[PDB]
């Protein structure tokens, strides 16, 4: 015997990785944080521009998820709308923790704190980012956790939850096996990853409150954001 994924699991992981790694110009966000104007308007513009590009990326990643096309079309839209917020926060946590130039963390925080976001929501946002950082996550972990977040059968209303469970279970199984292969000295690693998914769910309520605040302060969103975030 051995500790390896079976050939079908290696294949499934390969297409999740090929899809996840499809990132046009990853230096762009890094340079925007470092070089753009430091105004409340520019900071908000980075967020809507990055969040819009991310939704496009998320739909392309989602539609290629193993078995996603076997799903009822209303449940497909509900999974995408129900997971968009968590996926954005998980993706932000990934970029936050990447090897970035000196001062990037300080400049990014200076921007987040000048984006019309209340202090009440910045605290759990930074706490989550730091907890993600402590786990020292691989690209495989970020890609699989994102797929698991999208294919969640227990968050929002879904007509056929069993159909969604059946697509999520092999992803959870590939992820647990990768923790046994890549972190064998830490048997509680998988449970820590699942702990982070529990923490991710708190951002649904946080984001709903941030959106209400932005709308009150006459903030504009792109048609694609208005649709996925259900803005009126």
């Amino acid at each position: 015997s051995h500790m390896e994924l079976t050939p079908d699991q290696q294949t499934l992981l390969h297409f999740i990785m090929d899809s996840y790694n499809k990132q046009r110009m990853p230096q762009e966000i890094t340079n925007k944080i470092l070089k753009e104007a430091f105004s409340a308007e520019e900071n908000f513009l980075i967020l809507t521009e990055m969040a819009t590009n991310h939704v496009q990326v998320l739909v392309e990643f989602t539609k290629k998820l193993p078995g996603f096309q076997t799903l009822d079309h209303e449940d497909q839209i509900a999974l995408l709308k129900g997971s968009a917020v968590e996926a954005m926060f998980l993706r932000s946590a990934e970029i936050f923790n990447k090897k970035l130039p000196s001062g990037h963390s300080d400049l990014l925080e200076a921007r987040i704190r000048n984006s019309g976001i209340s202090d009440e929501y910045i605290t759990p946002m930074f706490s989550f980012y730091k907890s993600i950082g402590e786990l020292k996550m691989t690209q495989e972990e970020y890609a699989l956790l994102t797929a698991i977040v999208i294919l969640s059968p227990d968050r929002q209303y879904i007509k056929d939850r069993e159909a969604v469970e059946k697509l999520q279970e092999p992803l959870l199984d590939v992820l647990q096996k990768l923790c046994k292969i890549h972190q064998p000295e830490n048997p509680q690693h998988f449970a820590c990853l699942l702990g982070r998914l529990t923490e991710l769910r708190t951002f649904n309520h946080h984001h709903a409150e941030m959106l209400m605040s932005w709308r009150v302060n006459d903030h504009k969103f792109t048609p694609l954001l208005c649709e996925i975030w259900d803005v009126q």
Partner: peptide, 10 residues
């Protein structure tokens, strides 16, 4: 709508 288009395209 936009999401349906992005989901059903190609």
């Amino acid at each position: 709508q936009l999401l349906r288009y992005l989901l059903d395209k190609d």
